């Protein structure tokens, strides 16, 4: 597996289905013309390389597998000093469905 | 391209069998570390916190016979990440509160 | 795949510690900026915040490949594997890249050897404001950068044709100022460690006094008028005149301090300081006018409005 090349490179366009769950709409700072918002930033995509078949249909894993595989480099165009939470462990989840999603 | 290949062998030779744990001339005479500063700015003198903030180009030079080469006649400037593979003085500022 | 083999070949026997053409010729780097937003200008601390997409490109003969693929478009993963110039910003009080959701870096490699490397940066640059005439001051805030270690014989910079793609200025956090225009330079600064090529971008910022008028001048103008109505008040009303006089001058002191508070601790009188001091003279003189009056009223009714409006005439034109 090559972590550097996106899924379907040279044959497809990688379609990333995203969605947001706002856990809490933070305060608005009119002095700084900014606002804070805490979210569960969900994004899903198809990766044929990560296709398996075994006793289980979905592998519920931790952040360690995320760094080993290609993930979209999504960034916020108008973002200003966001933080990805780290306590107790990196607040992330990865789930690989048998079809590769 | 000879220099690119030749320079690669030289730098690779030096860092091979190099022990970062031992200072230059370990178990021998002290290593003379020369220091040289260039103050970029003194941001703010604070009486409330009894401190000042200073930005400088802190430079220090010393000799290391292990890192001596003579095949190429030029001074090699390398990536800053090489500093993590070389012994450097453990200089600290006894006054600094946050640097 | 056929792209993973290419990347393996490029990094095979690739020395990340050596610049392109080391000991052969200087490495020419073409820089380019897209100013996403010039953030708040911090006149008190003499700094400003700028968010940019700092793009710099160079040739690296080691990273040349021939195939049907014209460019290898990559994420931040490969940035640490290849040689990247050690560009730093000379006047940055504090800067940081962006890391949410992942490192905001991009990397593209062509067949011939071109490398395009861009990253998003928030730079808290240092702009040395000279507020001798405030709040009418105009500044030319720079942004210098160069290689920290590589001298002029090893790293040469140069502005691309598209110097600076300044973005839509409407959404900028620049409230005090207006972005007049930009100007670039390229010069060699000599230092103790060698001669380094420096490239600086000058942003011209022109102050707006609309806030300070309502914030500072208009309260300062209106309070001065409160002194003048002392004259129309009867002289026999000793507590009334002093009440107006002492109340008028004393609140002038508070206005000067709070107005002076907006400025930093600089040891020179500024134009805002000049206005409040002159307003201080009028209120003080108005109180002193009654002091001599009890111990003339009509003349003060004419001279005081004329002197202030005339004084404003001299001040504002300047
Ligand atoms: C004294 O102690 C302090 C700790 O108190 C040390 O500071 C720490 O140093 C380490 C190592 O340099 C830093 O780790 C690196 O962090 C990178 C991103 O950090 C961002 O998030 C952290 C929070 O997690 C913030 O603190 C950072 O901001 C602070 O630091 C920056 C400078 O880094 C300042 O500018 C800021 O003002 C803050 O002060 C950042 O916002 C992280 O990317 C990096 O990991 C990459 O690099 C390593 C290098 O081997 C790789 O192993 C790793 O896999 C990553 O590489 C991937 O990403 C790069 C990105 O381009 C690609 O190029 C690669 O190819 C690959 O894809 C590393 O983890 C740490 O952040 C920092 N601060 C802490 C811990 O608070 C001092 O260094 C230490 N020494 C001295 C002299 O002071
Ligand atoms: C790799 O890096 C080294 C060091 O940075 C370079 O060597 C320097 O080369 C320059 C170019 O000639 C030298 O410049 C002059 O050298 C004179 C010789 O002095 C020698 O004698 C004593 C030793 O006891 C020391 O002064 C010195 O370290 C030398 O060993 C100096 O006397 C000169 O001093 C003054 O010159 C003028 C006077 O107006 C001033 O402008 C200078 O700033 C200085 O005050 C001058 O320094 C330099 O001395 C060399 N230094 C060393 C340590 O060798 C290599 O050239 C470089 N290699 C490259 C680029 O390929
Ligand atoms: C940012 O810096 C760049 C680099 O100096 C500026 O662009 C460069 O401008 C010079 C001067 O105009 C160009 O040279 C001139 O070209 C014209 C047109 O061919 C020619 O008639 C002149 O005799 C002279 O040769 C230079 O080509 C150009 N850079 C490139 C890559 O072409 C740019 O103007 C600066 N941005 C500003 C000032 O806002
Ligand atoms: C790469 O291939 C092209 C044609 O396929 C050839 O012209 C070129 O010389 C080659 N470059 C090399 C081998 O460096
Ligand atoms: C709070 C300000 C008090 C008045 C200051 C008097 C000193 C002279 C200021 C004008 C000098 C050009
Ligand atoms: C009594 C005077 C109040 C208004 C002064 C305005 C002066 C504008 C100057 C414009 C530049 C010539
Ligand atoms: C000496 C300070 C001014 C006091 C008022 C004097 C009126 C003649
Ligand atoms: C009797 C004259 C009073 C002052 C005239 C108005 C000046 C503002
Ligand atoms: C301050 C202007 C109004 C008063 C003018 C008429 C006074 C007799
Ligand atoms: C621009 C604010 C000052 C206007 C002139 C006021 C003079 C009485």
Curated annotation (Swiss-Prot), chain A:
Where found in the cell? Answer: Postsynaptic cell membrane; Cell membrane; Cytoplasmic vesicle membrane
Q: What start-end ranges are recorded for coiled-coil regions in this protein?
A: none
Which residues does the annotation say bind 4-aminobutanoate?
42
Judging by the UniProt lineage, the source's domain of life is Eukaryota
KO phenotype (gene knockout): Gene knockdown in orbitofrontal prefrontal cortex results in an inability of mice to select actions based on their consequences, developing instead habit-like behavioral inflexibility.
Write out the tissue specificity statement of the associated record.
Answer: Expressed in the cerebellum.
Q: Which residues are glycosylated?
A: 86
Belongs to which family?
Answer: Belongs to the ligand-gated ion channel (TC 1.A.9) family. Gamma-aminobutyric acid receptor (TC 1.A.9.5) subfamily. GABRA1 sub-subfamily.
The record's note on quaternary structure and interaction partners says: Heteropentamer, formed by a combination of alpha (GABRA1-6), beta (GABRB1-3), gamma (GABRG1-3), delta (GABRD), epsilon (GABRE), rho (GABRR1-3), pi (GABRP) and theta (GABRQ) subunits, each subunit exhibiting distinct physiological and pharmacological properties. Interacts with UBQLN1. Interacts with TRAK1. Interacts with KIF21B. Identified in a complex of 720 kDa composed of LHFPL4, NLGN2, GABRA1, GABRB2, GABRG2 and GABRB3. Interacts with LHFPL4. Interacts with NLGN2.
Give a short account of what the protein does: Alpha subunit of the heteropentameric ligand-gated chloride channel gated by Gamma-aminobutyric acid (GABA), a major inhibitory neurotransmitter in the brain. GABA-gated chloride channels, also named GABA(A) receptors (GABAAR), consist of five subunits arranged around a central pore and contain GABA active binding site(s) located at the alpha and beta subunit interface(s). When activated by GABA, GABAARs selectively allow the flow of chloride anions across the cell membrane down their electrochemical gradient. Alpha-1/GABRA1-containing GABAARs are largely synaptic.
Instruction: Report the domain remarks.
Output: The extracellular domain contributes to synaptic contact formation.
- The protein in question is named Gamma-aminobutyric acid receptor subunit alpha-1
Q: Which organism is it from?
A: Mus musculus
Gene of this entry: Gabra1
Task: Specify first residue, last residue and whole-protein length for the fragment.
Answer: 52 to 152 of 455
From Swiss-Prot, chain B:
Q: Where in the cell is it found?
A: Postsynaptic cell membrane; Cell membrane; Cytoplasmic vesicle
What residues bear carbohydrate chains? 3, 75
* Binding residue positions for histamine: 92
In its record, the post-translational modification comment is:
Glycosylated.
User: What's the domain of life for this entry?
Assistant: Eukaryota
UniProt lists the family membership as follows:
Belongs to the ligand-gated ion channel (TC 1.A.9) family. Gamma-aminobutyric acid receptor (TC 1.A.9.5) subfamily. GABRB2 sub-subfamily.
Comment on protein domains: The extracellular domain contributes to synaptic contact formation.
What role does it play? Beta subunit of the heteropentameric ligand-gated chloride channel gated by gamma-aminobutyric acid (GABA), a major inhibitory neurotransmitter in the brain. GABA-gated chloride channels, also named GABA(A) receptors (GABAAR), consist of five subunits arranged around a central pore and contain GABA active binding site(s) located at the alpha and beta subunit interface(s). When activated by GABA, GABAARs selectively allow the flow of chloride anions across the cell membrane down their electrochemical gradient.
Self-association state and partner proteins as the record states: Heteropentamer, formed by a combination of alpha (GABRA1-6), beta (GABRB1-3), gamma (GABRG1-3), delta (GABRD), epsilon (GABRE), rho (GABRR1-3), pi (GABRP) and theta (GABRQ) chains, each subunit exhibiting distinct physiological and pharmacological properties. Interacts with UBQLN1. May interact with KIF21B. Identified in a complex of 720 kDa composed of LHFPL4, NLGN2, GABRA1, GABRB2, GABRG2 and GABRB3.
Q: What is this protein identified as?
A: Gamma-aminobutyric acid receptor subunit beta-2
* Source organism of this protein record: Mus musculus (Mouse)
**Organism ancestry:** Eukaryota, Metazoa, Chordata, Craniata, Vertebrata
> Gene encoding it?
Gabrb2
Q: Which residues of the full protein are shown?
A: 30 to 128 of 512
From Swiss-Prot, chain C:
Changes after translation:
Glycosylated. Palmitoylated by ZDHHC3/GODZ; required for the accumulation of GABA(A) receptors at the postsynaptic membrane of inhibitory GABAergic synapses.
Q: Which Gene3D superfamilies match?
A: Neurotransmitter-gated ion-channel ligand-binding domain, Neurotransmitter-gated ion-channel transmembrane domain
Subcellular location, principal: membrane
Supply one GO molecular-function term.
transmitter-gated monoatomic ion channel activity involved in regulation of postsynaptic membrane potential
Q: In which tissues is it expressed?
A: Expressed in brain neurons (at protein level).
Describe how its activity is regulated: Allosterically activated by benzodiazepines. Activated by pentobarbital. Inhibited by the antagonist bicuculline. Inhibited by zinc ions. Potentiated by histamine.
Do the record's keywords include Transcription? no
Other observations noted: This subunit carries the benzodiazepine binding site.
What name appears for this protein in its UniProt entry?
Answer: Gamma-aminobutyric acid receptor subunit gamma-2
